[PDB]
Amino acid sequence: LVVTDPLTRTECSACHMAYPAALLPARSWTALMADLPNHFGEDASLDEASRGQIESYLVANAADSSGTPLRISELPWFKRKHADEVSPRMLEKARSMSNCAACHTGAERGLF
Ligand code: HEC
Ligand code: HEC
C-alpha cells in the first residue's frame, strides 16, 4: 500500500520512493534500520530518536505483523513474478528493480 507515517514518508523518500512497510518482514526492517550508515553504498543515517520512531512504524506494519532479506526486490515472490514480466531491456531502462515507479505508474499510491 502506502506509507502514511509523516516521519517515515519524509525521511525514506529522500533517495527513492517510500517503500510500504507491508512489503518486508519485521526482522528485515530492523536490519536495515540498524545500518543506515552503510545503506546500499550510501549514508542514510538519522538521529537515533528518528531511527527508532521509523523502525517502530515499519515493524508494527511489516509483512509479518499481527492482523533476513534486505531488499523487496530479492523476495521470492518478487523474483518469480518479475522474471516472467520484465524484459532485459525494461530492466536496462529502469536501471534497477528498486525503481518501482519507472515501471509502475501508480507505485506512489500503492498500485502495482
Ligand atoms: C540516500 C541517502 C538514501 C536514503 C535517505 C534512504 N535510502 Fe533506501 N536505498 C538507497 C539506495 C542507494 C538503495 C539501493 C537502490 C538500488 O538501485 O540498488 C536503497 C534501497 C532501499 C531498499 C531496497 C529496495 C529494493 O531493491 O528492494 C529499501 C527497502 C530501502 N532502501 C529502505 C529505506 C528506508 C526504510 C529509508 C529511511 C530510513 C531509506 N531507504 C532511506 C538510498 C537511500
Ligand atoms: C520494470 C523494470 C519493473 C520494475 C522496476 C518493478 N516492476 Fe513490479 N512489475 C513489473 C511488471 C511488468 C509486472 C507485471 C504486471 C501485471 O499486471 O502482471 C510487475 C508486477 C508486480 C507486482 C504484481 C505481482 C503479482 O502477484 O503478480 C507487484 C506487487 C510489483 N510488481 C511490485 C513491484 C515493486 C514493489 C517494485 C520495486 C521494488 C517493482 N515492482 C519494480 C515491472 C516492474
UniProtKB/TrEMBL annotation:
Give the residues the record marks as binding heme c 2: H82, C100, C103, H104
Where heme c 1 is bound, by residue? C12, C15, H16, H39, R71, I72, S73, S96, S98
Q: Does the keyword ATP-binding apply?
A: no
Q: Which UniProt keywords apply?
A: Heme, Iron, Metal-binding, Signal
Return one GO MF term. Answer: metal ion binding
Q: Which domain of life is it from?
A: Bacteria
- The name of this protein is DHC, diheme cytochrome c
- The protein's organism comes out as Cereibacter sphaeroides (strain ATCC 17023 / DSM 158 / JCM 6121 / CCUG 31486 / LMG 2827 / NBRC 12203 / NCIMB 8253 / ATH 2.4.1.) (Rhodobacter sphaeroides)
Which lineage is the organism of this entry classified under, starting from the top rank?
Bacteria, Pseudomonadati, Pseudomonadota, Alphaproteobacteria, Rhodobacterales
Q: Which residues of the full protein are shown?
A: 35 to 158 of 161
